[PDB]
Amino acid sequence: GRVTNQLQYLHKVVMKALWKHQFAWPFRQPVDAVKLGLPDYHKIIKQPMDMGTIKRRLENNYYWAASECMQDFNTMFTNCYIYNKPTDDIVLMAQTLEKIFLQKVASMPQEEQELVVTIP
């Protein structure tokens, strides 16, 4: 991947705010459906995603475009809404975190530019 202004913003602003939030703990690591006794989790959820995985990807310059990282955040929230019951508190926690995600994304740099200054 590469380092861009937008991906650096996603790492140092958006992820920093979401990771520390009081509602982040269910999303800081992949769902362990074996330990949770949930044999249907991976039958229903085709693309598991979590903030621990996203954070490691950002640390390792896995992404090529901010939009890919935004899709990973979105998949994580969508998985929660699809799998759980509409009245479960975790749905409310995801809605709270996703609202912060969108609020912070609103102030991301407009044009994606690689943060490299190279010598030919």
Ligand SMILES: CC[C@@H]1C(=O)N(C)c2cnc(Nc3ccc(C(=O)N[C@H]4CC[C@@H](N5CCN(CC6CC6)CC5)CC4)cc3OC)nc2N1C(C)C
């Ligand atoms: C999946 C459906 C839905 C959903 O959509 N998502 C995203 C979701 C995600 N996560 C959870 N639960 C947990 C999440 C995280 C933890 C944790 O801190 N786990 C660590 C704590 C102990 C650690 N151990 C390991 C070895 N230990 C050494 C030996 C002495 C013990 C020392 C400590 C290992 C794991 C616990 C959870 O269970 C309480 N539920 C979810 N739901 C619920 C509605 C079921």
